[PDB]
Amino acid sequence: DEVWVVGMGIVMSLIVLAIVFGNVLVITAIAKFERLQTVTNYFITSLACADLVMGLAVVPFGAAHILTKTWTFGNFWCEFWTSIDVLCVTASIETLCVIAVDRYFAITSPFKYQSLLTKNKARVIILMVWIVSGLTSFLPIQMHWYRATHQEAINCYAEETCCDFFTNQAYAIASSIVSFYVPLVIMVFVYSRVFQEAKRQLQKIDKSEGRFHEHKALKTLGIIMGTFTLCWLPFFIVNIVHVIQDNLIRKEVYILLNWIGYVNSGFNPLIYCRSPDFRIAFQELLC
Amino acid sequence: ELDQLRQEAEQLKNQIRDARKACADATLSQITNNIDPVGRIQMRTRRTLRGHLAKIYAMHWGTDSRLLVSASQDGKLIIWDSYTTNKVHAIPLRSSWVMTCAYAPSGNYVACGGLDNICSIYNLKTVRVSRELAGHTGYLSCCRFLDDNQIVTSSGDTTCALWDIETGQQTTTFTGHTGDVMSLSLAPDTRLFVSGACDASAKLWDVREGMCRQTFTGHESDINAICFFPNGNAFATGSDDATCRLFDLRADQELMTYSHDNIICGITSVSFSKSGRLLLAGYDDFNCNVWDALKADRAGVLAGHDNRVSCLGVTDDGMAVATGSWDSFLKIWN
Amino acid sequence: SIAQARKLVEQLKMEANIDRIKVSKAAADLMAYCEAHAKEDPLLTPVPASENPFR
Amino acid sequence: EDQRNEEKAQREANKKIEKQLQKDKQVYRATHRLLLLGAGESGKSTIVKQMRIIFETKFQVDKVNFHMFDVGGQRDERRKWIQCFNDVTAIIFVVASSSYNMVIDNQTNRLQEALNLFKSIWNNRWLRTISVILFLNKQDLLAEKVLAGKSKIEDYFPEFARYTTPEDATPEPGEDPRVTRAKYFIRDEFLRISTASGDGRHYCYPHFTCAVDTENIRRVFNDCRDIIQRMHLRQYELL
Ligand SMILES: Nc1nc2c(ncn2[C@@H]2O[C@H](COP(=O)(O)OP(=O)(O)OP(=O)(O)O)[C@@H](O)[C@H]2O)c(=O)[nH]1
Ligand SMILES: CN[C@@H]1CCc2c(ccc(O)c2O)[C@H]1O
């Protein structure tokens, strides 16, 4: 029993450090140098900020709750922590969707991309994304609309030492639809169109000058799609499965999949910040 | 005959080379060995100017050490204000391709030129064009206001001219170069000036007489920049082989070369200081290096630009140095 | 042609007849000029913050 | 007092200068710049002419602004002003295809000089990321010379003996195999130089053009669109 506590703790601290360090480095590199301040990098900045907030707020407290197995703070802090977790999780995906849409516009509309996206519109888009993310996290949790109705939920809710997640079907469906399923089909369609563009361009080049001279697209699209899908897919299925009918999903599996979802934090800098200019920036400072 | 003409040329060059070799008593490094080095020099950015839509090729500090002008390929001349970092004027240009600009000593006129073989001047305090000078058969490289009525220009047709603004007609023309002329610098008394061509040579001219006086052929590649020592008996040049050489008018041969083994880039601008002890030169490595005039020892690096440096200037009072780069930004170092 | 060689040949003379001086005197003059105005230029010696207009 | 008055004077003028620039920044960023460059007697003025129905030109295609330059004032073998043209979208190259036997004062075949000029332009240090649109002008004189012509290309270019027509060639209907072979030999003579040191950062778009033609303006638009699309695809590591 003692061994499990020692092992679980080492993993949580390493995860927190890895989450914090990469996001802090990305933010510092973007802010310090004036060559990296473009329209595209603003979305990456917002994503990094949201991921840093999530990894600095909800991971240590969740680790304490699972290790100690007793919430020693008030119910108000439990509700606030749940609200922050939901807000960060639902705001760390719409930014990826916006980035995908931006790449779609850049690739498929090269002549009108400059006029379409300006520094004045990116701020509005980011503000709208953050507002719509926070509108579904604090509003239905600070207000008690997500509060359940069965006996176990009421029993835990009356107590001041247990902080678990109990929700009704309507919220469990609406939040999942807002967070995950809606921003998925858009990304799939966008990346399919981008792959078609790349394939046709490669075919044109090969037809034009093949006699003298698609692995690259797939390694990139496969990485980008697979990381996110494998990180966030099973949890957003069990979320609806365990509500549509009771006594199907154990709490341990739910918590394990939820914590698997958190690990996505440490991969965003490794995926969206691999440009050579970013490498030069990382070499300029702290090297 | 024609063969004799070659023969006559053959010895005169031998005589000149022998005389220059005999005049070499001792090297510069020997005499300047004893004096202590100035040590490391560190400069930090004080002001940053933004507002240009494209890369910058030219600038010129004002005589009041407060105002300056810059040119870019947007087709616009902007007269900044160093103290309060706010713009004063913005002059649209007929042609978007410009390579040089100048600021009148009296502070009333501004000139600019480019690919179009026309030198255009403007009236700041009346901003409309006042005169257009034509007659060259190539692009302009540099132009310096000799006075408020006459200007001297150098073009890409291996010639230089001394204009007259009031009449718009050339007064004297200078010939003798083979390659393109890229830069020039005037003496403090505006009696003599030099020019650096693309045939690896620099010549000293006489303004009033209009005849060449001396010739120097120390370099081995194109010459892009030229400066002039404040004493009035020396000048320095920068070339594409990453070498700076300090010539002398009285001796008529080079005295010392500035080079390092880790740089293989070119040189775009060369400037001195008020006392002439520091020689600042801009390179293609996106940074500027500071040398020591009498020792050829590096004493600092001016980094902070995101692209190559194409301009350099030091104020009349020597209070600050300003650099222009292709990143469309101007910086004031102190 | 024959004439162009003639101009270069005539000019090469004018340059050859100029009087010259030893390198030592030229170097000494530059040393004296640099030593005379050593304190003048702010670039060599950093100025106090009171008299600096760019701070 | 005066300091407040001077600042209210100076600050107001900056704001005005800033506003004018924002109006100019949009129109500056909207337009696309091109450079026209060719050898002597190539056909450059004529190609620019039917398009119409230092020298600068405005022409708009499908609500897109284009801007083309043709430099003729400076005529010299050494080109150093080329450093200013490293931010253009593309370079248009016009070469006379039918002048394979003229001699320029004695000098190599005119094509050989054009080939050397193209090789020098391609391998320039400052033009490492600039594409080239190639036009092979004078398409009818070449056919006239090939068909029932006393002069033979093998006399000037020895490599033609061991050169066969490509299997992927799609000649226009009605043309003899001989003109197709000559045309494709001329085209790959440039394609080899284009491909040798391309490094995957800029390509070439060869084309065939005669006097009676009116589709060049669409070809330039399509080539520019392809260039921008390829640049954007390569930037995100997708090509
Ligand atoms: N058959 C034919 N002749 C052409 C064509 N283009 C140009 N030419 C010939 O060339 C003439 C046009 O002038 P060019 O000598 O080509 O010169 P340019 O067009 O001014 O071009 P540059 O010499 O490069 O300045 C015409 O009168 C024709 O004799 C073409 O497409 N077909
Ligand atoms: C306890 N962790 C929470 C619980 C439910 C939930 C999450 C994320 C997004 C949602 O839309 C949710 O409804 C999880 O991060």
Short mmCIF file of C-alpha atoms in Angstrom, two decimals, chain B residues 51 53-55 57 73-74 76 78 81 84 86-90 95 97 99 115-117 137-139 179-180 182 198 222 224 240 284 308 326, chain D residues 7 10-11 13-14 17-18 20-21 24-26 28-29 33-34 54 67 69 71 73-76 78-81 83-88 126:
data_model
loop_
_atom_site.label_atom_id
_atom_site.label_comp_id
_atom_site.label_asym_id
_atom_site.label_seq_id
_atom_site.Cartn_x
_atom_site.Cartn_y
_atom_site.Cartn_z
CA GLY B 51 6.47 52.49 -39.60
CA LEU B 53 6.45 48.81 -44.89
CA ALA B 54 9.57 47.36 -46.55
CA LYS B 55 13.33 46.95 -46.25
CA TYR B 57 18.68 50.87 -47.86
CA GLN B 73 10.95 50.40 -51.43
CA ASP B 74 7.41 51.30 -50.33
CA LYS B 76 8.19 56.88 -49.05
CA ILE B 78 10.15 59.57 -43.51
CA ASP B 81 12.70 62.65 -34.51
CA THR B 84 10.51 61.91 -29.10
CA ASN B 86 7.56 60.52 -33.47
CA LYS B 87 7.32 61.13 -37.20
CA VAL B 88 7.38 64.61 -38.75
CA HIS B 89 7.07 64.21 -42.54
CA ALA B 90 6.08 61.55 -45.06
CA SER B 95 9.17 55.57 -58.28
CA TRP B 97 12.80 51.77 -56.30
CA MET B 99 18.82 53.34 -53.25
CA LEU B 115 16.75 52.78 -60.41
CA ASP B 116 15.25 55.63 -62.41
CA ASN B 117 18.19 57.71 -63.60
CA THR B 137 22.64 56.62 -68.10
CA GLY B 138 22.49 54.29 -65.08
CA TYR B 139 21.13 53.82 -61.59
CA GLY B 179 33.20 49.07 -62.95
CA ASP B 180 30.12 50.45 -61.24
CA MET B 182 28.80 52.43 -55.35
CA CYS B 198 33.32 47.68 -58.52
CA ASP B 222 33.72 44.66 -55.21
CA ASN B 224 30.46 48.56 -51.32
CA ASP B 240 32.92 41.66 -50.30
CA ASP B 284 25.68 40.34 -43.96
CA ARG B 308 21.08 42.12 -42.95
CA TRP B 326 16.13 44.93 -44.12
CA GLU D 7 3.52 68.40 -27.86
CA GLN D 10 3.70 67.43 -32.83
CA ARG D 11 1.55 64.56 -31.47
CA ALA D 13 0.72 65.24 -36.94
CA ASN D 14 2.03 61.73 -36.02
CA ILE D 17 0.78 60.07 -40.55
CA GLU D 18 -0.10 56.79 -38.82
CA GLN D 20 -2.47 57.46 -43.83
CA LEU D 21 -0.06 54.49 -43.57
CA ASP D 24 -1.61 52.39 -47.61
CA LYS D 25 -0.64 49.20 -45.82
CA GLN D 26 -3.73 47.34 -47.06
CA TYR D 28 0.44 47.58 -50.45
CA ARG D 29 -0.25 44.08 -49.12
CA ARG D 33 4.71 42.10 -57.83
CA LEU D 34 6.33 40.52 -60.89
CA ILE D 54 11.91 51.77 -65.85
CA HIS D 67 2.22 44.72 -60.93
CA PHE D 69 8.30 45.60 -64.09
CA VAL D 71 13.96 47.15 -66.77
CA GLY D 73 17.55 51.47 -68.81
CA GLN D 74 20.63 49.62 -67.55
CA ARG D 75 22.19 47.33 -70.18
CA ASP D 76 25.23 45.45 -68.90
CA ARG D 78 27.06 42.35 -64.81
CA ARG D 79 23.80 42.65 -62.84
CA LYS D 80 24.15 44.02 -59.31
CA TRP D 81 20.79 45.81 -59.02
CA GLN D 83 19.58 42.46 -55.02
CA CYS D 84 16.48 44.68 -54.79
CA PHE D 85 14.24 42.04 -56.44
CA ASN D 86 14.35 39.27 -53.82
CA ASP D 87 10.79 39.88 -52.56
CA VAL D 88 8.90 39.51 -55.85
CA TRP D 126 19.76 36.34 -53.16
#
